[PDB]
Amino acid sequence: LRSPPLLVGVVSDILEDGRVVVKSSTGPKFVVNTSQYINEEELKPGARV
Amino acid sequence: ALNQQTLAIVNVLPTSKDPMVYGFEVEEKPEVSYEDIGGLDVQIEEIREAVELPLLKPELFAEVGIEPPKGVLLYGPPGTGKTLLAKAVANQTRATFIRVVGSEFVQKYIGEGARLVREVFQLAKEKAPSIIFIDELDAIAARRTNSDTSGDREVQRTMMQLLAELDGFDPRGDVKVIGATNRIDILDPAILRPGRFDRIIEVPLPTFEGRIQIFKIHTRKMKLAEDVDFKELARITEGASGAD
Amino acid sequence: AVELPLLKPELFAEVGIEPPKGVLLYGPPGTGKTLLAKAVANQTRATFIRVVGSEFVQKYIGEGARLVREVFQLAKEKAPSIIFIDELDAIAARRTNSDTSGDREVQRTMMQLLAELDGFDPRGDVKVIGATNRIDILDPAILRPGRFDRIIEVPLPTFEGRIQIFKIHTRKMKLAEDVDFKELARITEGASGADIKAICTEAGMFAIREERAKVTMLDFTKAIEKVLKKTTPIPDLKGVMFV
Amino acid sequence: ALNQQTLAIVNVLPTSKDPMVYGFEVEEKPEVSYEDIGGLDVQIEEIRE
Ligand SMILES: Nc1ncnc2c1ncn2[C@@H]1O[C@H](COP(=O)(O)OP(=O)(O)OP(=O)(O)O)[C@@H](O)[C@H]1O
Ligand SMILES: Nc1ncnc2c1ncn2[C@@H]1O[C@H](COP(=O)(O)OP(=O)(O)O)[C@@H](O)[C@H]1O
Ligand SMILES: [Mg+2]
Ligand SMILES: [Mg+2]
């Protein structure tokens, strides 16, 4: 009943400086942290993450 | 319903109770059986075969290896009591009854007409078996030869949506339409054909006996004649309909 | 047109055969275009995407077009995929006009479709099965091959063709040993598969009445007479003056 | 990009508009390529100029 909330959003762009902007389904644009689960190499702007 | 602060599924389902089509289901249950309307006596038996009898005993159909009928398509003179014949079966079977005026569909908002009829059909499957009465097919039956540039495609879209729901890809849902027209010349070759409307029925003008039947029902709501002779009455009303 | 691309790809390789990118079906209704689409769906088991051409175009501007893109981008992930488009009658306007809501906005959702099936953005492996009643209210882009490379005409089933339809429905029913399907298909000349279903159900209504499981020859001919009579009339007239 | 915890500009951003499938999609790759100038050949000559 307690399954944690993980927000879903779609990538606005991929930054050259090794970061990514991603838009939450809340609304507010965020710059996220990369990770080794899903890289910026499986992703493109519009990718649902 | 989601338990907030983790916002995960905790409770199925409060969905959805949508009055837009939910509210056009049952008509407070019909008080009309086929013993409160006559005159179209011969037609009535045909209709009981196509709709009521599967429900009464399915096994008679399973037994002959046949698909049961998809209901009846009525044409005839306006006002003969096609509505009241739909009502008579619905009541008797003790199944779900969805009465839609079918001309109130077709919005001037594009494909909204189609959307709406998609919901009424879906609604039928969820509460299957359900008998649907689709009245008036003179404002939802399209014309393939142009006559209104904005009109033809719009009525067509709505029309082919409901056909799609009827047996296009999707199950019947044990509908059992039950749908009244008065013109068979305004229908498209797509809907005209059976397997969507298995037994195409001619509803004619009431016979000599039929005037008499209808008459006895209505004079029992009145104070009735004191110099009874119904042979006289029948003669005059020849050339008219059940509503008259 | 879809079996060989999945099951025989070495053929494609060896000979050098460009792949097919769709099949267009047209022909009078009730004949079993929908039955063929299901059968393919069941029996090649790969991603069977069923959509409907009246479902495109909703009450907001350009919603119908939005919806087409969603479908193509999902089809591209799911390839091999067959998109089965049911109904092409209301979605296409052979004629063009401007500033009409049934004849300009039905054209802005047509233009997104022409245009993802094949086009600049591929495909996937679709193999898009379109089916319609009439091509005479169907835009020519679809009509032309290139994409929808096999232009499959469908007629009303043949003399022999109709005898087989009868026999499928009878395979599920029963029969008597006086029954002759050929005589019945004759009468029912120029009739689609759907009509035949109604004959066999209606004949079944006579058998029921008389309390029998099997359908006999008499019951069928009785059903051809019954169904037809109630659809168009016979009485009228002799002179007077025409005698 | 503002510091999330309390606000202040911490990153200029090289500045974007939301490219998605717009300018991001560069495709001109095979089958259709420049090895396949099928035509209608004169038409392509006009475009080249
Ligand atoms: N060849 C056939 N043999 C047996 N029954 C058939 C045949 N064709 C159609 N039917 C029956 O009629 C039903 C309805 O027709 P169906 O939806 O298959 O038609 P369609 O040719 O795709 O038509 P449309 O032009 O209306 O799009 C079928 O699901 C089936 O039960
Ligand atoms: N056979 C009939 N018996 C009783 N009332 C009738 C009959 N036919 C029609 N009417 C009456 O006439 C009116 C209009 O006919 P209605 O049944 O609504 O039909 P339809 O849907 O065929 O136009 C109603 O008030 C209805 O009660
Ligand atoms: Mg009425
Ligand atoms: Mg079809």
Largest Cα separation within chain A, whole Å, is 40
Residue closest by Cα to atom 13 of ligand 1: B195
Q: Which chains pack against D, by 3+ Cβ pairs within 8 A? A: A, C
Q: Do C198 and B194 touch (CB under 8 A)?
A: yes
Instruction: Give the distance from residue A43's alpha carbon to the nearest chain D alpha carbon, in angstroms.
Output: 11
Q: Do the strands C22-26 and B72-75 form a parallel or antiparallel pair, or are they unpaired?
A: unpaired
DSSP 8-state assignment for residue D12: -
Q: Is C204 in the pocket of ligand 1 (CB under 6 A)?
A: no
C-alpha distance from residue C64 to each of C57, C69, C171, D29 (Å): 4, 9, 43, 30
Chain C residues with at least one Cβ partner in D under 8 Å: 120-121
Residues 6+ apart with CB under 8 A from B207: B39
Residue closest by Cα to atom 4 of ligand 1: C193
The structure tokens 């306007």 sit at: C93
What percent of the residues of chain C are helix, what percent strand, and what percent coil, each to the nearest 5? 40, 10, 50
Neighbours of B35 (CB within 10 A): 10
Q: Is B78 in the pocket of ligand 2 (CB under 6 A)?
A: yes
Residue closest by Cα to atom 16 of ligand 2: B81
> SS3 of C55, please?
coil
- Give the 3-state secondary structure of C118-160: CCCCCCCCCCEEEECCCCCCCCHHHHCCCCCCEEEECCCCCHH
Question: Quick check: do D and B touch, 3+ CB pairs under 8 A?
Answer: no
Please provide the DSSP assignment of C168-219 as one string. HHHHHS---SS--HHHHHHHT-S--HHHHHHHHHHHHHHHHHTT-SSPPHHH
- What's the one-letter identity of residue B215? F
> SS3 of C102, please?
coil
Neighbours of B149 (CB within 10 A): 16
A18 close contact with B: CB closer than 8 A = no
- Between CA A32 and CA B178 the distance in angstroms is 59
> SS3 of B30, please?
coil
> SS3 of B96, please?
strand
Q: Is residue B203 a contact partner of residue B74, using CB atoms and an 8 Å limit?
A: yes
A5 chain-B contacts, CB cut-off 8 A: 6-8
Backbone dihedral angles phi then psi of residue C81, each to the nearest 5 degrees: -155, 145
Report how far ligand 1's centroid is from the alpha carbon of B188 (Å).
16
- Between CA B93 and CA B89 the distance in angstroms is 6
**What angle separates helix B230-237 from helix B208-219, to the nearest 10 degrees?**
120
C39 chain-B contacts, CB cut-off 8 A: none
Q: Is residue B65 a contact partner of residue C172, using CB atoms and an 8 Å limit?
A: yes
Report how far ligand 4's centroid is from the alpha carbon of B30 (Å).
35
C203 chain-B contacts, CB cut-off 8 A: 66
Backbone dihedral angles phi then psi of residue B7, each to the nearest 5 degrees: 55, 50
B184: its two tokens? 């068979």
D18 close contact with C: CB closer than 8 A = no
Instruction: Spell D23-34 as b/e; 16+ CB within 10 A means b.
Output: eeeeeeeeeeee
Please provide the DSSP assignment of B134-185 as one string. EE--SSSS--SS-S-TTHHHHHHHHHHHHHHHHHTSS---S----EE-S-SS
Q: Is C88 annotated as a binding residue?
A: no
- Between CA C186 and CA C221 the distance in angstroms is 11
D4 chain-A contacts, CB cut-off 8 A: 30
Q: Is B44 in the pocket of ligand 2 (CB under 6 A)?
A: no
Q: Which atom of ligand 1 is nearest to the CA of B67?
A: 31
Which residue pairs, CB below 8 angstroms and at least 24 apart, start in D26-31? Answer: D27/C120, D27/C121
The structure tokens 């991929």 sit at: A14
B8 close contact with A: CB closer than 8 A = yes
Q: Do D11 and A45 touch (CB under 8 A)?
A: no
Q: Which chains pack against C, by 3+ Cβ pairs within 8 A? A: B, D
Strand B130-135: give its sheet, edge to edge: B96-101, B130-135, B179-180, B72-75, B199-202
C87 chain-B contacts, CB cut-off 8 A: 160, 163-164, 168
Report how far ligand 2's centroid is from the alpha carbon of C167 (Å).
43
* Chains B & C: contacts with CB separation below 8 Å: 148
Selection from B179, B218, B174 nearest residue B83 by Cα? B179
